[PDB]
Amino acid sequence: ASHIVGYPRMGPKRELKFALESFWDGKSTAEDLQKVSADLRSSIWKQMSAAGTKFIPSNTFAHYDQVLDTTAMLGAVPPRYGYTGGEIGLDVYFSMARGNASVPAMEMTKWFDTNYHYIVPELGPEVNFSYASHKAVNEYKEAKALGVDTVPVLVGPVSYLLLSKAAKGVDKSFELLSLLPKILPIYKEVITELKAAGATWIQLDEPVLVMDLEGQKLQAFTGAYAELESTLSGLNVLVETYFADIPAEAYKTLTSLKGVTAFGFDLVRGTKTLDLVKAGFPEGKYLFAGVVDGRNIWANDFAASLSTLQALEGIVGKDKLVVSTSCSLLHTAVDLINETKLDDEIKSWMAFAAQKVVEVNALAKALAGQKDEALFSANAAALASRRSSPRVTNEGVQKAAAALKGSDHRRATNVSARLDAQQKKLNLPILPTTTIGSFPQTVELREDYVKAIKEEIKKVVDLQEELDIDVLVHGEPERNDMVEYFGEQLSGFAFTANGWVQSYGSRCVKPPVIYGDVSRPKAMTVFWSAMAQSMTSRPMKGMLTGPVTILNWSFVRNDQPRHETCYQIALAIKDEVEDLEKGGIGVIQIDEAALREGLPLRKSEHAFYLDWAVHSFRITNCGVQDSTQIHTHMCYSHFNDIIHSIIDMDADVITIENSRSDEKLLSVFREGVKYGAGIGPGVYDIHSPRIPSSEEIADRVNKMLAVLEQNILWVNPDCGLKTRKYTEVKPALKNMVDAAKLIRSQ
Numbered sequence: 001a002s003h004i005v006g007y008p009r010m011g012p013k014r015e016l017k018f019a020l021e022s023f024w025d026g027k028s029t030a031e032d033l034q035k036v037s038a039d040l041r042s043s044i045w046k047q048m049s050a051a052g053t054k055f056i057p058s059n060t061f062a063h064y065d066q067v068l069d070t071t072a073m074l075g076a077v078p079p080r081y082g083y084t085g086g087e088i089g090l091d092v093y094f095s096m097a098r099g100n101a102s103v104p105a106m107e108m109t110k111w112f113d114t115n116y117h118y119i120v121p122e123l124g125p126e127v128n129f130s131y132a133s134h135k136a137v138n139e140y141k142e143a144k145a146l147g148v149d150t151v152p153v154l155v156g157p158v159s160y161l162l163l164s165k166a167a168k169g170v171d172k173s174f175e176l177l178s179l180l181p182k183i184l185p186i187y188k189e190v191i192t193e194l195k196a197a198g199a200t201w202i203q204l205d206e207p208v209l210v211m212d213l214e215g216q217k218l219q220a221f222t223g224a225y226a227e228l229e230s231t232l233s234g235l236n237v238l239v240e241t242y243f244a245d246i247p248a249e250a251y252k253t254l255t256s257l258k259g260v261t262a263f264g265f266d267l268v269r270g271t272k273t274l275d276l277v278k279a280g281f282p283e284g285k286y287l288f289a290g291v292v293d294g295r296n297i298w299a300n301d302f303a304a305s306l307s308t309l310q311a312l313e314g315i316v317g318k319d320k321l322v323v324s325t326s327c328s329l330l331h332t333a334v335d336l337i338n339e340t341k342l343d344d345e346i347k348s349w350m351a352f353a354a355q356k357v358v359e360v361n362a363l364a365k366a367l368a369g370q371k372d373e374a375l376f377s378a379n380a381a382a383l384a385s386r387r388s389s390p391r392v393t394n395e396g397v398q399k400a401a402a403a404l405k406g407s408d409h410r411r412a413t414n415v416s417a418r419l420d421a422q423q424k425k426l427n428l429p430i431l432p433t434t435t436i437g438s439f440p441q442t443v444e445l446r447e448d449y450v451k452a453i454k455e456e457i458k459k460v461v462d463l464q465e466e467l468d469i470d471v472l473v474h475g476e477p478e479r480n481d482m483v484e485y486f487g488e489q490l491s492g493f494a495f496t497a498n499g500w501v502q503s504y505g506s507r508c509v510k511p512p513v514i515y516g517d518v519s520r521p522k523a524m525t526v527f528w529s530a531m532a533q534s535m536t537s538r539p540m541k542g543m544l545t546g547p548v549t550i551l552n553w554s555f556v557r558n559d560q561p562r563h564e565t566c567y568q569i570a571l572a573i574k575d576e577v578e579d580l581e582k583g584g585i586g587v588i589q590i591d592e593a594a595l596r597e598g599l600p601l602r603k604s605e606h607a608f609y610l611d612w613a614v615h616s617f618r619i620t621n622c623g624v625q626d627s628t629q630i631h632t633h634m635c636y637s638h639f640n641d642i643i644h645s646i647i648d649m650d651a652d653v654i655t656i657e658n659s660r661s662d663e664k665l666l667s668v669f670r671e672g673v674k675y676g677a678g679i680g681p682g683v684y685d686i687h688s689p690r691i692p693s694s695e696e697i698a699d700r701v702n703k704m705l706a707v708l709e710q711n712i713l714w715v716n717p718d719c720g721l722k723t724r725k726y727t728e729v730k731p732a733l734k735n736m737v738d739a740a741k742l743i744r745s746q
């Protein structure tokens with residue numbers, strides 16, 4: 001049998017994207033949107049079954065988020081929204097989702113370790129839970145009436161609570177898992193209506209079981225399914241887990257939960273679970289083998305899969321083994337059959353969702369003796385291509401056996417005995433002003449030199465006149481996507497035409513694709529950066545994108561360990577740094593916006609990640625002078641749990657985030673750490689259109705002088721000004737300089 005754990009909910013050409021925004025625009029109504037949603041929903045079920053898909057999921061579709069879909073299912077709507085009861089419709093739903101013009105929208109956080117963000121529920125002891133949304137049962141019927149039987153996918157009761165958060169007031173000591181009693185009754189009613197409509201299988205998504213859970217929490221799972229058993233009578237229950245391997249303890253709790261008859265394992269990222277199963281599995285319980293990476297974009301190693309699936313068939317195979325995606329296809333793109341610009345051979349090497357739906361089957365039939373030989377013949381051939389094609393392997397893939405020359409710390413020169421030189425070369429005043437990288441746009445017409453400069457010099461003619469700014473920037477005009485920019489200008493980067501993935505709400509991201517060994521044969525920055533530092537007699541911050549960000553925000557190849565690719569990228573950058581140097585750019589800022597992003601969900605693994613991660617950064621500027629100043633830029637307000645790694649990046653002046661945090665948190669530097677190096681946390685919120693005050697800045701900018709060590713303190717924004725209007729930033733920045741001035745004055 002075959003099974004897909006989840007599917008994208010936007011469309012092949014992002015139909016729901018515009019249908020969604022549209023309704024919110026006010027240029028379309030429910031009826032029309034509903035028309036679209038249901039239509040897309042139909043096309044998916046139809047598309048899925050017609051491929052042979054045995055277990056087709058329903059309820060994966062969402063108007064915004066799945067955890068919200070379940071927040072409405074439990075009527076767990078926040079007070080400030082004014083819900084009185086009854087069936088929750090587009091009003092209350094989209095409120096919570098994106099707020100209205102009188103109340104704010106709920107907080108969204110990252111989905112486990114994915115590039116997806118969900119809407120964290122706000123729970124507490126005073127919320128009145130109720131069956132407020134028949135989306136599940138409704139969709140089940142819709143699919144049945146269309147001729148296709150589906151498996152309702154529900155977010156596990158306990159994962160739901162663990163993923164939630166206690167809303168304001170709820171005293172610190174309140175345990176969220178203390179609500180299992182108020183929510184479980186509702187799960188029952190829902191599970192009852194599904195049995196009632198015909199459902200013969202259900203799916204509780206309990207991904208949190210792949211997390212490091214304490215025995216008391218693991219035990220929380222046990223009490224839920226115990227209490228659920230009766231309602232689960234006569235009904236196959238598939239409990240899904242994904243993104244990592246299951247801890248041996250979690251494996252015990254899982255494989256012994258009540259009513260659960262099937263178990264979903266992510267065997268792409270959690271093959272380590274293979275052992276646990278190899279060493280013991282329930283009897284007549286199913287094992288959905290998640291061997292088809294629904295998380296990347298590459299074809300599957302059909303052969304490999306069969307080996308894995310076969311031995312699995314070994315353990316059981318008595319018809320209890322089901323082929324499945326490693327996780328929800330929500331995390332991969334839709335149709336690779338919308339990838340035109342991409343040459344043949346390369347695409348021959350990729351497979352998006354729709355394509356993956358099919359693989360699951362070629363592998364399901366091949367395990368049932370229906371092995372469509374024409375598929376493996378082609379696959380294996382495409383595998384052959386990739387592993388050979390000189391578009392992959394290289395001699396750059398040799399400059400690596402030299403990076404084994406011990407670490408790559410920036411040439412002894414303790415940053416402290418290095419600042420002494422950087423300053424000399426450019427005498428800057430205490431609390432040096434500056435920006436982050438990007439700048440607001442104008443007309444913006446989608447030669448180019450005569451025009452490009454016109455804008456760059458205005459960006460500079462401004463930086464100068466405008467609030468001095470001890471160090472200006474070129475405002476990244478020539479760069480749309482800070483990661484794409486460099487990809488197009490690189491070796492192992494291909495770009496897809498319609499390969500989109502969702503990020504949150506109606507928003508998405510088309511990540512560059514890293515197919516082979518990265519390499520920068522020609523100068524990328526230099527030109528524009530050099531052109532900029534000549535239009536002034538002030539330090540100019542050269543601009544680069546750290547190799548960790550690039551890696552993360554891009555579909556990296558599943559053939560060699562991340563870092564290995566990360567490093568290749570790190571080396572490529574090492575150039576543009578020593579060229580903006582030769583070129584004559586003094587100060588240079590390298591940014592790592594997505595550094596914490598690639599953090600493994602398994603705690604004993606954070607160490608290894610942060611390792612190659614921060615090292616690859618060094619590898620970028622380890623061949624730089626002692627007078628060449630370096631700035632790193634990360635988009636985080638928290639480093640408390642990763643302050644050491646910041647200390648190992650060896651940045652002369654690191655610029656991070658802040659704006660809406662404490663002035664005291666900054667002592668995570670001045671405590672048992674002793675950073676001792678230019679630090680610059682943001683003093684102006686750029687996601688808040690609204691202008692700040694000269695008075696507001698210079699006081700918090702004083703609450704840094706007294707929490708840090710004003711003597712290595714910088715004055716910069718919060719992040720690039722790319723998404724702020726010139727009118728919102730002009731008065732704004734101006735007030736960020738006056739602050740330093742005064743404060744200095746004394």
Ligand SMILES: Nc1nc2c(c(=O)[nH]1)NC(CNc1ccc(C(=O)N[C@@H](CCC(=O)O)C(=O)O)cc1)CN2
Nearest residue numbers: 481482483484503504506507508509510511512553
């Ligand atoms: N490589 C690259 N990848 C990225 C980012 C980047 O900086 N560069 N920044 C990221 C953080 N998340 C988001 C989520 C949504 C949007 C967004 O608003 N997207 C528009 C399209 C934006 C566009 O024109 O690109 C949409 O509606 O689909 C932008 C960043 C994620 N991935």
Ligand SMILES: N[C@@H](CCS)C(=O)O
Nearest residue numbers: 436437438591593720
């Ligand atoms: N400075 C760059 C990278 C930060 S995300 C920018 O402003 O886009």
Ligand SMILES: [Zn+2]
Nearest residue numbers: 634635718719
């Ligand atoms: Zn930032």
Ligand SMILES: [Zn+2]
Nearest residue numbers: 644645647648
């Ligand atoms: Zn260290």
